[PDB]
């Protein structure tokens, strides 16, 4: 009886309001009994110089370690008094804290969040303990090869800019970070104009607004003096980085080009194009009948263990490309097939594959936002990136307007005859030279 | 406000098939078919049949070929998945609203009429070596499978994956027999989220009714207990000590769940100290090295296992296991505080409610209830039953644990782990 368009139109609308200190409160009512409430902050590693790099990760470690009013390990017990899940994360441009709980605990839960992002006590003994733990984590992070390769891709792609800096920061900085630096970081970056208070589940908007007025009115939002950290354009560089470790069994490679950015119309088209290329893992069940030519070829010929495509967005820049894990005797074949597929998209795209990619993007968009945590995350990121939450109807309208011509033009703009950035880790003796990779970015026939 | 959520329609056909639907108005639709075809229904002469059957969902069928199924599923952006526990198999299909009619055709063709051609089945054999290997990268899977082998004798002892010796020896006749014997109307349930009731009823009557002809019944779970120790020289020692607890859908099962949350079931806070977790605080008082411990619970239709799982370095394994056993003993003797029982009850209620918020979790819960009891219980009744548990029943559960034949499994550098008699 219903339809796709009618179902899209029936989703309830997000409601947004703004307090006097500059805080923004967004929420989305629903009939479920549970809820998720959190605070998103526009402060990551990109707003850090070389002197204080890794400060944000250090502060994020010390968040759930007591405050002025809940000293010691009391705060943790309070959360577990109500069976709620308290979680946080940090990235290169954003930070987030949030709580999953019941509807009934919405008053108490918010009262905890305001405690966390205002009154970080930062006990010195806790600072020393977390310093030791962070050093252990920095030592142990070398075991994950995917994350190493992504850090290398960032470091080489955005060399000489803040985007090269990793989230955790160098091991030398963490050994010298003092309580003065952490307090300065908190006093500079955690401010009401840069925070968003999102919620999603069973609740009503005015109750959340009243609770926010109670527990967040103390934040300063005047931007004291000219202490207004503003980003600047970041230079992209085509380059290669290769870490040779022949003892390892598998090689990890990641190749990328410069992307459009957060708020560009082109992004949707790119999300279609990547969906045409797809992804593959050795445990997939499709086999040789998979629609993607790259996946079918890799499955039949065993070119790689796995591959995937990514489009990572930042303010006015980003990475667009692929990452694969493969044997040390298959890198040339994988690079050849990947670049051939990119050139095929740039020069000649048909209606059927574009329709398949559009359907894939529709299904992924629908399925990703199903719950309470993903919706709250969507609100929090949208209010900082776009300044407003885009309904799903607008997403369908944007997706439905793509066709073969648009995909060809966008791909020719962003992929064809461009200098990429390449990162390789492991037994990578067979990885082609940079001149060969560069020459593979066009065709003589075209 | 949005329209009120309509009641979950429930039906049991005369042939024994169960059909359940919930007509929300989300953009997507999700349809699941649940069968009692777990690994426990394998005998000793056809082990690994269920594992191969799980990976054979994409093969040729009478309705359509492998190429057609794969290309048609991926053309409309749909997703086909198969899941299997020790007791049940679940075929799930997710897509958009206006694409169920196509995909409903594929799903039954995967289930009600496979072919299992010789060359196709033969080509799929090496996959069993890959997937199992991936599943064995995590030590927990190996330890839990060994624990099930040690605790039980016949039915629930069968692993989820094929034995290494039998890879490449599974023939189409075994698969045909397994499907013909276990995939029948009285052992099936059809759940839908995002489609109406008459559509599912028509589909089931047209197709799933002919599959009737109910076959085997299966064995009964025999509990014996024992030890399995596998040394492999890894950095950390994993161990698990359990005992017979209870059957699912019973009064004592709620008591064992409450006891699990009293003892501790992992952290609720990122990098938390587990301050409320009694077991972690009991162990950490003596042991001053990194470690980890949690309560383990697993209930089935006729038997269940309750106990605890530990991860600790080789020198300190005995200290950790002794401390955890002592803490459970002290709880058994009577030392239990009503505030802690209430906190555990709140943890249980919060976890159960938050588990079924997603479409996947809701479909899994509805299917499990449909197969087990043949009736849908709303969340409110479950909450009332959880609150109804008396604090003395938790003590009774601890007494049942402390005075029963233990079953232990372990892995790592087993130079200092104790045996059952030492504890």
């Amino acid at each position: 009886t219903a339809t796709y368009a009618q179902a899209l139109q029936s989703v309830p609308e997000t409601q947004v309001s703004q307090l006097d200190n500059g805080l923004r409160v967004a929420s989305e009512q629903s009939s479920q009994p549970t809820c998720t409430v959190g605070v998103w902050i526009d402060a990551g590693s990109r707003y850090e110089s070389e002197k204080n790099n890794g400060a944000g990760y250090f502060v994020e470690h010390l968040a759930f370690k007591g405050t002025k009013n809940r000293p010691g390990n009391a705060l943790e017990k309070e959360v577990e008094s109500m069976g709620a899940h308290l979680n946080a994360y940090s990235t290169r441009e954003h930070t987030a804290y949030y709580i999953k709980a019941l509807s009934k605990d919405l008053p108490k839960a918010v009262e905890l969040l305001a405690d966390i992002v205002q009154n970080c006590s930062l006990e010195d003994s806790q600072i020393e303990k977390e310093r030791d733990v962070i050093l252990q984590e920095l030592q142990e992070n070398d075991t994950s090869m995917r994350d190493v390769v992504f850090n290398y891709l960032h470091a080489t792609a955005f060399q000489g800019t803040p985007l090269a800096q990793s989230v955790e920061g160098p091991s030398e900085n963490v050994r010298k970070l003092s309580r003065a630096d952490l307090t300065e970081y908190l006093s500079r970056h955690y401010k009401a104009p840069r925070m968003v208070l999102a919620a999603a589940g069973g609740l009503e908007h005015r109750q959340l607004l009243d609770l926010a007025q109670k527990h967040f009115s103390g934040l300063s939002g005047t931007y004291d003096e000219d202490a207004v950290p503003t980003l600047s354009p970041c230079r992209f560089t085509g380059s290669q980085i290769c870490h040779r470790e022949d003892g390892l069994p598998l090689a990890h490679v990641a190749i990328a080009v410069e992307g459009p950015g957060w708020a560009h119309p082109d992004n949707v088209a790119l999300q279609v194009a990547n969906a045409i290329i797809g992804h593959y893992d050795c445990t997939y069940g499709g086999g040789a009948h998979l629609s993607s030519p790259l996946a079918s070829i890799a499955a039949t010929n065993k070119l790689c263990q796995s591959f995937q495509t990514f489009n990572i967005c930042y303010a006015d820049t980003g990475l667009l490309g692929a990452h694969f894990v493969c044997d040390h005797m298959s890198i040339d074949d994988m690079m050849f097939v990947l670049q051939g597929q990119w050139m095929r998209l740039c020069t000649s795209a048909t209606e059927s594959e574009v329709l398949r990619g559009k359907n894939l993007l529709r299904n992924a968009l629908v399925s990703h936002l199903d719950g309470t945590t993903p919706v709250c995350e969507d609100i929090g990121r949208s209010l900082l990136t776009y300044g407003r939450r885009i309904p799903l109807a607008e997403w369908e309208s944007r997706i439905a307007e793509v066709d073969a011509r648009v995909v060809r033009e966008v791909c020719s703009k962003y992929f064809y005859d461009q200098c990429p950035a390449v990162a390789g880790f492991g037994p990578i003796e067979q990885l082609p030279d940079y001149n060969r990779i560069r020459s593979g970015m066009f065709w003589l026939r075209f | 406000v949005p329209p009120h959520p309509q009641d979950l329609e429930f039906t049991r056909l005369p042939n024994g098939l169960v059909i359940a639907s919930l007509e929300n108005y989300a953009p997507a639709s999700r349809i699941g078919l649940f069968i009692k075809a777990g690994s426990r229904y394998e005998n000793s002469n056809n082990l690994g049949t269920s594992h191969l059957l799980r990976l054979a969902s994409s093969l040729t069928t009478k309705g359509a070929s492998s190429f057609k199924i794969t290309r048609g599923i991926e053309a409309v952006g749909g997703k086909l998945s198969v899941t299997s526990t020790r007791e049940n198999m679940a075929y799930t299909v997710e897509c958009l609203r206006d694409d169920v009619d196509i995909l409903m055709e594929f799903l039954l063709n995967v289930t009600t009429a496979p072919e299992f051609r010789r060359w196709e089945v033969a080509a799929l054999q090496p996959q069993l070596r890959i997937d199992k290997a991936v599943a064995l990268q995590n030590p927990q899977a190996h330890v839990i499978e060994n624990l099930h082998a040690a605790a039980y004798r016949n039915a629930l002892a069968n692993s989820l994956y094929c034995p290494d010796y039998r890879i490449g020896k599974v023939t189409p006749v075994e698969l045909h027999d397994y499907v013909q014997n276990h995939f029948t109307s009285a052992r099936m349930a059809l759940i839908g989220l995002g489609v109406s009731h008459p559509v599912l009823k028509q589909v089931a009557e047209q197709f799933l009714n002919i599959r009737g002809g109910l076959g085997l019944s299966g064995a009964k779970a025999k509990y014996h207990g024992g030890e399995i120790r596998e040394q492999n020289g890894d950095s950390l020692v994993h161990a698990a000590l359990v005992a017979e607890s209870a059957a699912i859908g019973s009064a004592e099962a709620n008591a064992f769940s409450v006891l699990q949350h009293v003892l501790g079931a992992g952290p609720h806070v990122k990098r938390g100290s587990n301050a409320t977790s009694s077991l972690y605080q009991a162990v950490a008082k003596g042991v001053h090295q990194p470690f980890d411990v949690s309560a383990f619970n697993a209930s089935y239709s006729d038997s269940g296992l309750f106990g605890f799982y530990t991860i600790s370095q080789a020198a300190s394994a005995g200290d950790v296991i002794k401390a955890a056993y002592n803490q459970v003993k002290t709880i058994a003797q009577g030392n239990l505080s009503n505030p802690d029982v209430q906190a555990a009850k709140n943890k249980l209620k919060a976890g159960y409610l938050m588990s079924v918020e997603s479409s996947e979790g809701f479909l899994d819960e509805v299917g499990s209830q449909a197969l087990a009891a043949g009736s849908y219980t709303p969340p409110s009744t479950v909450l009332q039953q959880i609150d109804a548990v008396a604090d003395a029943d938790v003590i009774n559960a601890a007494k049942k644990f402390v005075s029963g034949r233990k079953s232990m499994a372990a892995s790592g550098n087993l130079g200092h782990t104790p045996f059952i008699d030492e504890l």
């Binding site: - | 086909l80 998945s81 526990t85 599943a135 330890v143 839990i144 980890d292 383990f296 619970n297």
Partner: peptide, 20 residues
Amino acid sequence: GQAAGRPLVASVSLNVPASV
């Protein structure tokens, strides 16, 4: 949170990595 606490489950998919 590395310790197992619930009975294991095996998942296999057409276009998703398998998990346990």
